[PDB]
Every structure is written in C-alpha cells, then in structure tokens.
Amino acid sequence: KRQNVRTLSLIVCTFTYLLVGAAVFDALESDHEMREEEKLKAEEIRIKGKYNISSEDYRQLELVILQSEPHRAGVQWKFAGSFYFAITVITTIGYGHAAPGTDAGKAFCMFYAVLGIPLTLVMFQSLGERMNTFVRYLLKRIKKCCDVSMENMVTVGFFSCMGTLCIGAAAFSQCEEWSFFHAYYYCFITLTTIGFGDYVALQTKGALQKKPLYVAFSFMYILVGLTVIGAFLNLVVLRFLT
Amino acid sequence: KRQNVRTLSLIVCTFTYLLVGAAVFDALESDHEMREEEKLKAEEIRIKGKYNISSEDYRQLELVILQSEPHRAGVQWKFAGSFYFAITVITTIGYGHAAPGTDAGKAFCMFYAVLGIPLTLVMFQSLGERMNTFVRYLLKRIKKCCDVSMENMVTVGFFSCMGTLCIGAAAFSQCEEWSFFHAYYYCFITLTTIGFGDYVALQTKGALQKKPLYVAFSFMYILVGLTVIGAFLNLVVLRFLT
Numbered sequence A, B: 001k002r003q004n005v006r007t008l009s010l011i012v013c014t015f016t017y018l019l020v021g022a023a024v025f026d027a028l029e030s031d032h033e034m035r036e037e038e039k040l041k042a043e044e045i046r047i048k049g050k051y052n053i054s055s056e057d058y059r060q061l062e063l064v065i066l067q068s069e070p071h072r073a074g075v076q077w078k079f080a081g082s083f084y085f086a087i088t089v090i091t092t093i094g095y096g097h098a099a100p101g102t103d104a105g106k107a108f109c110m111f112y113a114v115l116g117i118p119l120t121l122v123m124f125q126s127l128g129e130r131m132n133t134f135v136r137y138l139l140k141r142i143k144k145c146c147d148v149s150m151e152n153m154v155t156v157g158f159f160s161c162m163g164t165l166c167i168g169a170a171a172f173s174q175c176e177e178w179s180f181f182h183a184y185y186y187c188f189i190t191l192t193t194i195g196f197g198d199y200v201a202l203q204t205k206g207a208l209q210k211k212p213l214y215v216a217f218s219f220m221y222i223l224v225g226l227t228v229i230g231a232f233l234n235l236v237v238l239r240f241l242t
Ligand SMILES: CC(C)CCC[C@@H](C)[C@H]1CC[C@H]2[C@@H]3CC=C4C[C@@H](OC(=O)CCC(=O)O)CC[C@]4(C)[C@H]3CC[C@]12C
Pocket: A114, A115, A118, A119, A122, B005, B006, B009, B010, B236, B237, B240
C-alpha cells in the first residue's frame, strides 16, 4: 500500500545518506585527527618531562581545568546568563551555557523544556506565517507598481536567508573578532538549532555583564534568524508534511 | 484582527515564561556556582603554589588539555564515530563529537545538514503517523476483544513515552554505570534534541571500537525515542499548527 511503500522508501534514502556522509567525513578528517593527536601528545610529553609532573596529580589538573572552563567567562548564572540559558533551552539549541549541577535544577529544566517547547514552536510558526504573508503582500505591491508564483516566493526566501546569514556573520566578525567564514558557520549552526560549532558568543571578557546592548542585539538577531528559518520551513518543507 | 491578536498574545506569554525561568535558574544556581568557583580556585592556587607553575606556561597547559579532551576517548573519526556524528547532525543534536577543524569539512557539514534536515523530519513524521495508526488499531482491537477518544490516545502516548524513557535510563545506568536520575536526564536531553546535558555516552574505554552491539543498540534506541517523540508531537502539538 502507499503508506508502507512511502515509509520503506524514506528509510532507505536516509540510511544511504548517512553512510555517504560518514564515509566522506572519515576520509576527510582521519589524517587531521591523527596529526592533531600526534602534536598534542608530543607537546604534553615535552611539558611533562620539563616540569616533572607526577602521573597521579596529572588527572587532578585535567579535572580542575575542565570544571573551570565555564567559570573563565565570568559569572554565568546571573540574570543575563540565566536568560541566555533559558533561551537556548526553549529554542532547543542547548549549548553555550553550563549544565546545572543540582538534581532539582535538572528536574526544573526538564519541566521547563516540556512546558515551553510546544509554545515556542507554535509562536515561531505563527510569526513565520505572518512574515510570509507580509512578504507576499510586498511582492504583490512591487509587481503592481512596476499573480505571484511559488518559485518567486522560494527565491525571495532564499535571498532573505542568505542576506540575514551574511549580516549576522559580518556583525559577529566585527564584534567577536572572528573570521568571516567562521562567523558564517557559527551563524548557520545557531540558526539550524544544532548548538555546537566550536564557537560561542557572549563568552569573552565578561560581555554578558558589560555590554547589555550587544546581548540585546544578539538575542534579536537569534530571534529574527529563527523566525526566518521557520518561515522558510513552512514555505518549502511543511507542505510535504500533511 | 485574529492573526495580530494571536501573534501579540503568544509573544507576551513567551517573554513572561522566559523571565520566570531565568529568575528561578539564577536563584537556584548562583550559590552553587559561587561555591564551585571558590573551590576550584582554591584548588588551582594550591596546586600552582605546590608545583611552582609559571603564569606564561599555565595557559599552554589549559589549551593542550582542552584540545585533547575529545582525543581521550580514542579515534573519534572512524566509521562508527563518523556515523555517530552524521546521526547527531541530521537529528539536530549536535553534541557528543568534536567539531571538524577543516574549512572544507565545515562547508560539507553545512551542505549535509541543509540537504538532510527536511528528509529526516519528513521520515520521522511519516513513521510517527504510522506508529499512531498502529496504536489506534491496537487500542480498537483491545476494546473490541474486551470508538476511541483522544484522551485515551494521549494517555497511551504519555505512558509509552514514560516507559521508553525508563527503559533507556535503566539500560544506560547498567551500561554507562550512571545514576538512574542522571541516566533519565541524559535520555530526556537526547530525545528532546537539546544535545548537551554534561553527559555523553559511547565515550568510555573506546566503546565505539570494541562494542559494536552497544553502538547498534544505542542507535536503535535513539531512533525509537525520536520516532515516539515525533508521534507525540503530531498527536498533541501538530493540530495547533494549521
Ligand atoms: C504533555 C505536554 C507535551 C503538553 C504540552 C502543552 C501544550 C499542548 C499547550 C501548552 C501551552 C499551550 C498554548 C498556550 C497558548 C496558546 C494561545 C492560543 O491563542 C488564542 O487562544 C488566541 C488565538 C486563537 O484563537 O487561536 C492558541 C493556543 C496556544 C498556542 C496553546 C496551544 C497548546 C499549548 C502549546
């Protein structure tokens, strides 16, 4: 029947894509990982030989450094830090902040995510629909002053996504002193709800407590990018759902 | 009009929820963060005084330890590691694997996510719909052998979610030697597409290369949990979309 055939066809393509991606990633990163591992030991062996660090005390230093990594960025559990953590939790980003060490805190975070994810999803969907309607109205007005097809809507949405990504990359490069490609990759990771791209904002020189304007701009940009992504998904992906 | 009223009403509730969550998180974690910071310095100050570590060379040790953290789990860019990374990328988890250090690799990952996210979403939606249909058929057969309402479907879905979460928590506690609550929290984080909860599996004693059965079971459990979550979202959340 149609349902079973569709499901079986969908399963196979995903597995094939997974295999292809895994093979390409392995073939592209095996040598780099080997070189990085070789360099890092050599360096750690040299420094341990120079400083005569005992094996037993070496693990304690690693644990202390790993546990103190979030604390380097300042006080992450302030009002701004808590707001950023809540934003990441509700938007299913889940990176940049430090996981709470309290069982009650973990339970509260679980309940918060459960009660907040559908609301955020519905709000994003509604705002994306409103943005799509506004874009359609603007296109109709432009055509009248100078019948809209989908392809035009798809092209407009893609151009808007590219422009937003470029603007965010430029802003983050000017603020975080990052490369243009690295800033673009970080913006893409943030807007795709992945969360981890080996980069994080609002974690340098205590920017969470001394630059409220930067935090507000980052939050507004994140919200705008998420709304644009949701609108694009509604335009191109949601038709194939039901 | 209805559209604008809905759009403006959703935003206010979302902002109020964000403020409440941030306030609660701050009030619950400020003291814990302060105590952890105090303990970690005291320890680092004591160890630096004991070993007489120079300030200039201290940063190099931190950089080496931070860069070598993924490498401590073995060769992460093998076939199993690449498959795990691809699974995390397509499922918008984005945690458990080190980010690639190559610009070409980053571009390939971006293209992979772009071309794979809608396909995975559609496959999950279709499989969740099939699971919902099968559950409805089973409930109808049970009622006949011993007219189904929604509330019954919602209760059945919630019970299935709780059972799957408990089974996953028990399995991870028996395998990863974690606490029951910690395993439950990790399973909830994984199934909610958050990704980071300070707990990561398949990263101990090289389990990615010596326990293929464990990796296969973990992948199957992740897929089953994601399918169940998608089915629940279709049952309760998707009606309010369109
Ligand atoms: C077991 C767990 C997953 C339950 C999760 C609860 C959700 C199913 C609830 C909680 C908050 C609810 C929302 C709270 C507020 C609103 C605004 C409400 O808007 C109006 O009443 C005015 C506009 C209109 O008429 O639609 C529409 C429903 C909605 C999105 C609700 C939809 C259903 C939500 C997401």
